[PDB]
Ligand binder design. Sequence first.
Ligand SMILES: Nc1ccn([C@@H]2C[C@@H](O)[C@H](COP(=O)(O)OP(=O)(O)O)O2)c(=O)n1
Ligand SMILES: [Ca+2]
Ligand SMILES: [Ca+2]
Length: 342
Amino acid sequence: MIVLFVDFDYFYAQVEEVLNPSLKGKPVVVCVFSGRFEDSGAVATANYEARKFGVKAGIPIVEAKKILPNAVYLPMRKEVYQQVSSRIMNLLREYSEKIEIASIDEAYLDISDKVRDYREAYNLGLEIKNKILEKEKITVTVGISKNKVFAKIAADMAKPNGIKVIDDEEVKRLIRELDIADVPGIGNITAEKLKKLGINKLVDTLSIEFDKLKGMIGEAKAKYLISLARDEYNEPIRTRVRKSIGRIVTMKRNSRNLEEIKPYLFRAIEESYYKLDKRIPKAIHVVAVTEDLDIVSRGRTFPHGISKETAYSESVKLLQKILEEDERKIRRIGVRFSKFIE
DNA sequence: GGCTACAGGACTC
DNA sequence: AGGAGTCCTGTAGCC
Ligand SMILES: Nc1ccn([C@@H]2C[C@@H](O)[C@H](COP(=O)(O)OP(=O)(O)O)O2)c(=O)n1
Ligand SMILES: [Ca+2]
Ligand SMILES: [Ca+2]
């Protein structure tokens, strides 16, 4: 298998750039304003000008404002970004039919059937960039290798506005010299559990006993890392089918009062049903973030599709069950729908 | 022992 | 300290 991965660079910021090029060269911070008070919320993304000075995704807008007060701060406009993304994804469809759209700004192409060797792939990646640069004036980063993981790793090493192939020898060099924390799916909690155990690099998972590693990180993550380390990871590029849709909103004040949480719950439901479109869910989950930022949720599956009016009703009962079974105040509340009708 | 549904955890961002 | 979505795991109810 040969896999080409494309990752759009600083995507939300770059779209804002394209809709207003006067922004180009200045630091740009796309934000999610929670609506508690002036500048409550977080940075969803920043362009590389802003990232130099430390303003990056996840930090609070307040923290960012300290560092770059003259930077342009823009509210997230996801609908816009999604339409730019859908257009870019169809351009990619012209270069392969086996396409896996992984997020709003990431896609894998199986380019076995389209390419013979890696240097031919690298020219294919130059074509794809320039097409996207011409058509949408969006820079992207391309990663090419033997599988999805190492193509993503390639693009991680090359962004922004980069191209890179990791050949079959490079893969073997990475197996034993890549900080295992740079492997997709290995976050901070799992990184630690690997150190607190011995494993700093992928090759190390072959020397530890399986049950010991399985004990720490779980069967699936152990099987995954092992398969990567043996160079036997080969998972297919397959079309991703959306499995759930939902909305969570931040309330202006924390609360355990049913009657003042309800309006936010109901808006989240109205917004979620719009977004559902023609999809009919058989399952609903109410999700709350407590004041100490812990996530609590209750859900029910139905032997039939959930009408909006049933959503309204079941959601209050599920919310009541949260209030009853968990004693902490609620800060954020929404819903999530799943198990769609086929 | 092994299957299915839930509620939480971890990760991608 | 926002918002969205996925896969995985421990537990319980049931063959
Ligand atoms: N915590 C984060 C991280 C990234 N993002 C958004 C969501 C995702 O679609 C987009 C991708 O990130 P971006 O292109 O800015 O940079 P990178 O590719 O993530 O380095 O940023 C977010 O909303 N929240
Ligand atoms: Ca990305
Ligand atoms: Ca990106």
